[PDB]
Amino acid sequence: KNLEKRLLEELNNSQGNMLENDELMVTLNNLKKEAMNIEKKLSESEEFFPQFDNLVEEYSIIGKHSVKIFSMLEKFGQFHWFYGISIGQFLSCFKRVFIKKSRETRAARTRVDEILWLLYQEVYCQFSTALDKKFKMIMAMTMFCLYKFDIESEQYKEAVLTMIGVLSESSDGVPKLTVDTNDDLRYLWDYVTTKSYISALNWFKNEFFVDEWNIADVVANSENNYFTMASERDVDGTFKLIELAKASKESLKIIPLGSIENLNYAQEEISKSKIEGGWILLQNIQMSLSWVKTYLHKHVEETKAAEEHEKFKMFMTCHLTGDKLPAPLLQRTDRVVYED
Incomplete structure (x- = not known):
């Protein structure tokens, strides 16, 4: 718009002869420079669009994984009084997962996978303080397939199928044995048989404990x-x-x-x-x-x-x-x- 401006008045004195042009070039030579420099910048400006888009997909790992998780966390509303968990708290967990843990916590793609593991950890670490052991257990019981396994469905054997009346049941004494099943995978073939004694739920031991429960730590x-x-x-x-x-x-x-x-x-x-x-x-x-x-x-x-x-x-x-x-x-x- 300043070119619009500065390239106005001396129309009244030139006819296009280079000797005439020379006095108008006191603005154009300056413009040769910067106007062409604009174009340099403009060419560069496109590259950011698709790459930025790419960056979005780079974090979709946890994007979908974790958005599914909140949609499960919300269902804890069934808990009558202590489950008053705001999604702000949910986000707080990730304030920690993403950063508020250490200087190593930032957002590398290798570690996008690792924060699926911290997503796994830190999420239940907080719900488990307000919710009791029954709710804690069923969480792990079905959700870890997502939280750290990325929807790795796992075939249930004795107890689960006992409740429904489905053919595939063995008692407490089948560990990780003949677990070789389809999409609906292995180790509940194991654990669900060990469930002849229900503490088999606890026996999952799938890193299922509140890392920071220590209420004394919580104090701060x-x-x-x-x-x-x-x-x-x-x-x-x-x-x-x-x-x-x-x-x-x-x-x-x-x-x-x-x-x-x-x-x-x-x-x-x-x-x-x-x-x-x-x-x-x-x-x-x-x-x-x-x-x-x-x-x-x-x-x-x-x-x-x-x-x-x-x-x-x-x-x-x-x-x-x-x-x-x-x-x-x-x-x-x-x-x-x-x-x-």
């Missing part, structure tokens, strides 16, 4: 994510927390929630400890639903305070039989469940 998380301990009737979640506190060797306070004076203490000591930077165990917040109503903002408040003085770690416990804790706060906290 974002401060806003306060800890939620799920328990049941006759299960002292607080106990697990006092053992934690004993191990932490840090400022411990415990406030049972439920009656009015406890709310007075909640207001009180939260404001104290959210400045001091203590470690506090809270119990049975569901016994004080009105507290919860105010608490949800108190949560916001003490969260900011946690950010400010930097050590206010809260550990609310005693989810009981069916106290149906509210999703907003469950969201804002870490739902880890314990057995008795």
